[PDB]
PDB file of N, CA and C in Angstrom:
ATOM      1  N   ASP O   1      -4.642   2.720  12.017  1.00 54.56           N
ATOM      2  CA  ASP O   1      -5.918   3.228  12.380  1.00 54.56           C
ATOM      3  C   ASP O   1      -6.929   2.425  11.640  1.00 54.56           C
ATOM      4  N   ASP O   2      -7.689   3.095  12.579  1.00 52.18           N
ATOM      5  CA  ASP O   2      -9.054   2.686  12.653  1.00 52.18           C
ATOM      6  C   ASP O   2      -9.803   3.079  11.391  1.00 52.18           C
ATOM      7  N   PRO O   3     -10.076   4.329  11.046  1.00 52.70           N
ATOM      8  CA  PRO O   3     -10.700   4.515   9.759  1.00 52.70           C
ATOM      9  C   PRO O   3      -9.739   5.230   8.871  1.00 52.70           C
ATOM     10  N   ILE O   4     -10.116   5.445   7.595  1.00 49.91           N
ATOM     11  CA  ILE O   4      -9.302   6.250   6.738  1.00 49.91           C
ATOM     12  C   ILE O   4     -10.051   7.523   6.536  1.00 49.91           C
ATOM     13  N   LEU O   5      -9.590   8.611   7.184  1.00 49.60           N
ATOM     14  CA  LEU O   5     -10.259   9.872   7.064  1.00 49.60           C
ATOM     15  C   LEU O   5     -10.054  10.408   5.682  1.00 49.60           C
ATOM     16  N   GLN O   6      -8.805  10.372   5.172  1.00 50.69           N
ATOM     17  CA  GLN O   6      -8.574  11.013   3.908  1.00 50.69           C
ATOM     18  C   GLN O   6      -7.814  10.112   2.996  1.00 50.69           C
ATOM     19  N   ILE O   7      -7.992  10.344   1.680  1.00 53.79           N
ATOM     20  CA  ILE O   7      -7.299   9.606   0.668  1.00 53.79           C
ATOM     21  C   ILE O   7      -6.667  10.606  -0.244  1.00 53.79           C
ATOM     22  N   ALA O   8      -5.395  10.381  -0.629  1.00 56.29           N
ATOM     23  CA  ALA O   8      -4.762  11.310  -1.521  1.00 56.29           C
ATOM     24  C   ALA O   8      -3.981  10.527  -2.526  1.00 56.29           C
ATOM     25  N   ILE O   9      -3.867  11.065  -3.756  1.00 54.86           N
ATOM     26  CA  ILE O   9      -3.102  10.370  -4.746  1.00 54.86           C
ATOM     27  C   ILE O   9      -2.063  11.282  -5.299  1.00 54.86           C
ATOM     28  N   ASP O  10      -0.839  10.747  -5.438  1.00 56.85           N
ATOM     29  CA  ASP O  10       0.231  11.465  -6.054  1.00 56.85           C
ATOM     30  C   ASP O  10       0.170  11.057  -7.485  1.00 56.85           C
ATOM     31  N   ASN O  11      -0.341  11.969  -8.327  1.00 57.68           N
ATOM     32  CA  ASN O  11      -0.562  11.705  -9.716  1.00 57.68           C
ATOM     33  C   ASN O  11       0.741  11.473 -10.412  1.00 57.68           C
ATOM     34  N   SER O  12       1.768  12.270 -10.068  1.00 56.51           N
ATOM     35  CA  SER O  12       3.025  12.198 -10.760  1.00 56.51           C
ATOM     36  C   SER O  12       3.704  10.883 -10.525  1.00 56.51           C
ATOM     37  N   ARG O  13       3.613  10.309  -9.306  1.00 56.96           N
ATOM     38  CA  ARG O  13       4.376   9.111  -9.099  1.00 56.96           C
ATOM     39  C   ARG O  13       3.480   7.923  -8.910  1.00 56.96           C
ATOM     40  N   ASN O  14       2.166   8.054  -9.180  1.00 59.17           N
ATOM     41  CA  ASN O  14       1.271   6.939  -9.030  1.00 59.17           C
ATOM     42  C   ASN O  14       1.427   6.358  -7.661  1.00 59.17           C
ATOM     43  N   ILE O  15       1.330   7.216  -6.635  1.00 62.45           N
ATOM     44  CA  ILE O  15       1.495   6.809  -5.271  1.00 62.45           C
ATOM     45  C   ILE O  15       0.266   7.158  -4.506  1.00 62.45           C
ATOM     46  N   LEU O  16      -0.182   6.215  -3.655  1.00 64.09           N
ATOM     47  CA  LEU O  16      -1.391   6.418  -2.920  1.00 64.09           C
ATOM     48  C   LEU O  16      -1.027   6.715  -1.506  1.00 64.09           C
ATOM     49  N   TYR O  17      -1.810   7.600  -0.872  1.00 63.86           N
ATOM     50  CA  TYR O  17      -1.581   7.976   0.486  1.00 63.86           C
ATOM     51  C   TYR O  17      -2.883   7.809   1.187  1.00 63.86           C
ATOM     52  N   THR O  18      -2.834   7.350   2.449  1.00 59.28           N
ATOM     53  CA  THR O  18      -4.047   7.271   3.196  1.00 59.28           C
ATOM     54  C   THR O  18      -3.777   7.839   4.546  1.00 59.28           C
ATOM     55  N   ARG O  19      -4.713   8.658   5.058  1.00 59.69           N
ATOM     56  CA  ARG O  19      -4.531   9.173   6.379  1.00 59.69           C
ATOM     57  C   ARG O  19      -5.626   8.574   7.194  1.00 59.69           C
ATOM     58  N   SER O  20      -5.296   8.068   8.396  1.00 57.47           N
ATOM     59  CA  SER O  20      -6.303   7.455   9.207  1.00 57.47           C
ATOM     60  C   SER O  20      -6.699   8.433  10.264  1.00 57.47           C
ATOM     61  N   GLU O  21      -7.747   8.080  11.028  1.00 54.43           N
ATOM     62  CA  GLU O  21      -8.264   8.949  12.043  1.00 54.43           C
ATOM     63  C   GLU O  21      -7.200   9.193  13.065  1.00 54.43           C
ATOM     64  N   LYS O  22      -6.423   8.146  13.401  1.00 51.67           N
ATOM     65  CA  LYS O  22      -5.408   8.261  14.410  1.00 51.67           C
ATOM     66  C   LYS O  22      -4.272   9.140  13.984  1.00 51.67           C
ATOM     67  N   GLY O  23      -4.031   9.331  12.672  1.00 50.59           N
ATOM     68  CA  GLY O  23      -2.929  10.198  12.346  1.00 50.59           C
ATOM     69  C   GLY O  23      -1.800   9.384  11.799  1.00 50.59           C
ATOM     70  N   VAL O  24      -2.088   8.154  11.332  1.00 51.45           N
ATOM     71  CA  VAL O  24      -1.048   7.371  10.725  1.00 51.45           C
ATOM     72  C   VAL O  24      -1.176   7.533   9.241  1.00 51.45           C
ATOM     73  N   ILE O  25      -0.041   7.514   8.509  1.00 51.18           N
ATOM     74  CA  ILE O  25      -0.133   7.701   7.088  1.00 51.18           C
ATOM     75  C   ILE O  25       0.381   6.439   6.483  1.00 51.18           C
ATOM     76  N   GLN O  26      -0.167   6.063   5.317  1.00 50.34           N
ATOM     77  CA  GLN O  26       0.323   4.893   4.656  1.00 50.34           C
ATOM     78  C   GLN O  26       0.424   5.242   3.204  1.00 50.34           C
ATOM     79  N   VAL O  27       1.604   5.017   2.592  1.00 50.58           N
ATOM     80  CA  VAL O  27       1.776   5.333   1.196  1.00 50.58           C
ATOM     81  C   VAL O  27       1.989   4.128   0.302  1.00 50.58           C
ATOM     82  N   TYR O  28       0.956   3.692  -0.431  1.00 50.55           N
ATOM     83  CA  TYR O  28       1.105   2.490  -1.208  1.00 50.55           C
ATOM     84  C   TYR O  28       1.597   2.845  -2.575  1.00 50.55           C
ATOM     85  N   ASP O  29       2.449   1.969  -3.150  1.00 51.69           N
ATOM     86  CA  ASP O  29       2.906   2.163  -4.491  1.00 51.69           C
ATOM     87  C   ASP O  29       1.832   1.585  -5.351  1.00 51.69           C
ATOM     88  N   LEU O  30       1.284   2.386  -6.281  1.00 47.09           N
ATOM     89  CA  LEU O  30       0.235   1.854  -7.094  1.00 47.09           C
ATOM     90  C   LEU O  30       0.912   1.203  -8.247  1.00 47.09           C
ATOM     91  N   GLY O  31       0.617  -0.092  -8.443  1.00 48.53           N
ATOM     92  CA  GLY O  31       1.218  -0.825  -9.511  1.00 48.53           C
ATOM     93  C   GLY O  31       0.104  -1.457 -10.263  1.00 48.53           C
ATOM     94  N   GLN O  32       0.440  -2.054 -11.417  1.00 50.34           N
ATOM     95  CA  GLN O  32      -0.549  -2.682 -12.235  1.00 50.34           C
ATOM     96  C   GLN O  32      -1.100  -3.855 -11.490  1.00 50.34           C
ATOM     97  N   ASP O  33      -0.241  -4.571 -10.736  1.00 52.40           N
ATOM     98  CA  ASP O  33      -0.700  -5.765 -10.088  1.00 52.40           C
ATOM     99  C   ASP O  33      -1.174  -5.485  -8.695  1.00 52.40           C
ATOM    100  N   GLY O  34      -1.420  -4.212  -8.328  1.00 54.97           N
ATOM    101  CA  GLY O  34      -1.947  -4.027  -7.006  1.00 54.97           C
ATOM    102  C   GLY O  34      -1.202  -2.947  -6.298  1.00 54.97           C
ATOM    103  N   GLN O  35      -1.427  -2.859  -4.971  1.00 52.65           N
ATOM    104  CA  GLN O  35      -0.800  -1.855  -4.165  1.00 52.65           C
ATOM    105  C   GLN O  35       0.363  -2.500  -3.492  1.00 52.65           C
ATOM    106  N   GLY O  36       1.466  -1.744  -3.325  1.00 53.60           N
ATOM    107  CA  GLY O  36       2.606  -2.322  -2.681  1.00 53.60           C
ATOM    108  C   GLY O  36       2.946  -1.461  -1.517  1.00 53.60           C
ATOM    109  N   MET O  37       2.838  -2.044  -0.313  1.00 52.40           N
ATOM    110  CA  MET O  37       3.148  -1.343   0.889  1.00 52.40           C
ATOM    111  C   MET O  37       2.620  -2.271   1.954  1.00 52.40           C
ATOM    112  N   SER O  38       2.222  -1.838   3.179  1.00 48.78           N
ATOM    113  CA  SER O  38       2.189  -0.536   3.767  1.00 48.78           C
ATOM    114  C   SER O  38       2.602  -0.673   5.197  1.00 48.78           C
ATOM    115  N   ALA O  39       4.520   1.221   4.360  1.00 45.53           N
ATOM    116  CA  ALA O  39       5.427   2.029   5.083  1.00 45.53           C
ATOM    117  C   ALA O  39       4.524   2.981   5.797  1.00 45.53           C
ATOM    118  N   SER O  40       4.957   3.515   6.941  1.00 46.47           N
ATOM    119  CA  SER O  40       3.997   4.377   7.545  1.00 46.47           C
ATOM    120  C   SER O  40       4.702   5.483   8.233  1.00 46.47           C
ATOM    121  N   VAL O  41       4.010   6.631   8.367  1.00 43.91           N
ATOM    122  CA  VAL O  41       4.603   7.643   9.180  1.00 43.91           C
ATOM    123  C   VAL O  41       3.658   7.805  10.308  1.00 43.91           C
ATOM    124  N   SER O  42       4.204   7.989  11.514  1.00 41.43           N
ATOM    125  CA  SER O  42       3.359   8.119  12.652  1.00 41.43           C
ATOM    126  C   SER O  42       3.963   9.200  13.475  1.00 41.43           C
ATOM    127  N   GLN O  43       3.357   9.454  14.640  1.00 39.15           N
ATOM    128  CA  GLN O  43       3.806  10.473  15.532  1.00 39.15           C
ATOM    129  C   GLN O  43       5.198  10.132  15.957  1.00 39.15           C
ATOM    130  N   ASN O  44       5.460   8.833  16.187  1.00 39.93           N
ATOM    131  CA  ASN O  44       6.745   8.393  16.649  1.00 39.93           C
ATOM    132  C   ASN O  44       7.779   8.725  15.617  1.00 39.93           C
ATOM    133  N   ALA O  45       7.477   8.457  14.334  1.00 39.95           N
ATOM    134  CA  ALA O  45       8.434   8.688  13.292  1.00 39.95           C
ATOM    135  C   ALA O  45       8.759  10.147  13.247  1.00 39.95           C
ATOM    136  N   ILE O  46       7.734  11.002  13.400  1.00 40.67           N
ATOM    137  CA  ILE O  46       7.930  12.421  13.318  1.00 40.67           C
ATOM    138  C   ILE O  46       8.830  12.865  14.424  1.00 40.67           C
ATOM    139  N   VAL O  47       8.616  12.333  15.643  1.00 45.29           N
ATOM    140  CA  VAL O  47       9.401  12.760  16.765  1.00 45.29           C
ATOM    141  C   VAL O  47      10.835  12.473  16.472  1.00 45.29           C
ATOM    142  N   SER O  48      11.121  11.266  15.959  1.00 43.74           N
ATOM    143  CA  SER O  48      12.479  10.917  15.672  1.00 43.74           C
ATOM    144  C   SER O  48      12.976  11.849  14.614  1.00 43.74           C
ATOM    145  N   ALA O  49      12.083  12.222  13.679  1.00 41.12           N
ATOM    146  CA  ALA O  49      12.450  13.037  12.561  1.00 41.12           C
ATOM    147  C   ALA O  49      12.932  14.384  13.000  1.00 41.12           C
ATOM    148  N   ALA O  50      12.234  15.044  13.949  1.00 42.17           N
ATOM    149  CA  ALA O  50      12.662  16.378  14.266  1.00 42.17           C
ATOM    150  C   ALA O  50      14.053  16.329  14.804  1.00 42.17           C
ATOM    151  N   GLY O  51      14.263  15.538  15.870  1.00 43.55           N
ATOM    152  CA  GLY O  51      15.573  15.333  16.411  1.00 43.55           C
ATOM    153  C   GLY O  51      16.236  16.643  16.718  1.00 43.55           C
ATOM    154  N   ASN O  52      15.492  17.769  16.753  1.00 41.25           N
ATOM    155  CA  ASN O  52      16.201  18.985  17.031  1.00 41.25           C
ATOM    156  C   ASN O  52      15.223  19.992  17.558  1.00 41.25           C
ATOM    157  N   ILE O  53      13.946  19.897  17.129  1.00 40.42           N
ATOM    158  CA  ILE O  53      12.943  20.837  17.554  1.00 40.42           C
ATOM    159  C   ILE O  53      11.767  20.067  18.085  1.00 40.42           C
ATOM    160  N   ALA O  54      11.014  20.635  19.061  1.00 42.12           N
ATOM    161  CA  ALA O  54       9.828  19.937  19.478  1.00 42.12           C
ATOM    162  C   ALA O  54       9.057  20.713  20.516  1.00 42.12           C
ATOM    163  N   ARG O  55       7.711  20.552  20.493  1.00 46.98           N
ATOM    164  CA  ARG O  55       6.791  21.074  21.474  1.00 46.98           C
ATOM    165  C   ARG O  55       5.430  21.123  20.853  1.00 46.98           C
ATOM    166  N   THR O  56       5.274  21.936  19.788  1.00 46.38           N
ATOM    167  CA  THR O  56       4.022  22.054  19.093  1.00 46.38           C
ATOM    168  C   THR O  56       3.718  20.680  18.606  1.00 46.38           C
ATOM    169  N   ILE O  57       4.778  19.930  18.243  1.00 46.98           N
ATOM    170  CA  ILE O  57       4.591  18.577  17.824  1.00 46.98           C
ATOM    171  C   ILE O  57       4.668  17.747  19.072  1.00 46.98           C
ATOM    172  N   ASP O  58       3.814  18.076  20.063  1.00 45.18           N
ATOM    173  CA  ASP O  58       3.852  17.344  21.295  1.00 45.18           C
ATOM    174  C   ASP O  58       3.003  16.134  21.119  1.00 45.18           C
ATOM    175  N   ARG O  59       3.122  15.166  22.046  1.00 49.03           N
ATOM    176  CA  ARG O  59       2.350  13.974  21.892  1.00 49.03           C
ATOM    177  C   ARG O  59       0.893  14.282  22.024  1.00 49.03           C
ATOM    178  N   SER O  60       0.523  15.063  23.054  1.00 50.54           N
ATOM    179  CA  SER O  60      -0.863  15.358  23.267  1.00 50.54           C
ATOM    180  C   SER O  60      -1.364  16.215  22.152  1.00 50.54           C
ATOM    181  N   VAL O  61      -0.602  17.274  21.831  1.00 49.47           N
ATOM    182  CA  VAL O  61      -0.985  18.248  20.852  1.00 49.47           C
ATOM    183  C   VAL O  61      -1.032  17.642  19.483  1.00 49.47           C
ATOM    184  N   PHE O  62      -0.119  16.700  19.191  1.00 48.47           N
ATOM    185  CA  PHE O  62       0.034  16.200  17.852  1.00 48.47           C
ATOM    186  C   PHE O  62      -1.224  15.632  17.288  1.00 48.47           C
ATOM    187  N   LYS O  63      -1.667  16.241  16.173  1.00 51.66           N
ATOM    188  CA  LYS O  63      -2.765  15.747  15.408  1.00 51.66           C
ATOM    189  C   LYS O  63      -2.532  16.284  14.040  1.00 51.66           C
ATOM    190  N   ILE O  64      -3.441  14.400  12.181  1.00 49.67           N
ATOM    191  CA  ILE O  64      -2.914  15.344  11.241  1.00 49.67           C
ATOM    192  C   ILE O  64      -4.085  15.958  10.561  1.00 49.67           C
ATOM    193  N   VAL O  65      -4.045  17.291  10.404  1.00 55.18           N
ATOM    194  CA  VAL O  65      -5.122  17.995   9.780  1.00 55.18           C
ATOM    195  C   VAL O  65      -5.289  17.581   8.352  1.00 55.18           C
ATOM    196  N   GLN O  66      -4.211  17.675   7.547  1.00 58.16           N
ATOM    197  CA  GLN O  66      -4.372  17.387   6.153  1.00 58.16           C
ATOM    198  C   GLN O  66      -3.065  16.905   5.619  1.00 58.16           C
ATOM    199  N   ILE O  67      -3.123  16.207   4.472  1.00 59.33           N
ATOM    200  CA  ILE O  67      -1.947  15.712   3.824  1.00 59.33           C
ATOM    201  C   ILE O  67      -2.043  16.126   2.390  1.00 59.33           C
ATOM    202  N   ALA O  68      -0.910  16.523   1.783  1.00 56.34           N
ATOM    203  CA  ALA O  68      -0.960  16.890   0.400  1.00 56.34           C
ATOM    204  C   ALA O  68       0.234  16.289  -0.263  1.00 56.34           C
ATOM    205  N   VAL O  69       0.038  15.764  -1.485  1.00 57.32           N
ATOM    206  CA  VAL O  69       1.118  15.155  -2.202  1.00 57.32           C
ATOM    207  C   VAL O  69       1.829  16.223  -2.965  1.00 57.32           C
ATOM    208  N   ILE O  70       3.139  16.021  -3.203  1.00 58.46           N
ATOM    209  CA  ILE O  70       3.918  16.961  -3.952  1.00 58.46           C
ATOM    210  C   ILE O  70       4.369  16.264  -5.196  1.00 58.46           C
TER     211      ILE O  70
END
């Protein structure tokens, strides 16, 4: 995506997360020499992920409201 709607930081693991308008997530490893990445989760990844349940996570319906680091 296009813009980065939200930014989140995992304090415990020094990991950066970015959520874009489109709903793609990117998690950079924060290192002394810079950011290392960027792995991504997308709607496609999620679909593959469920592999057992689906509907609310429909393509049309699918959108991400918020992301929180654990």
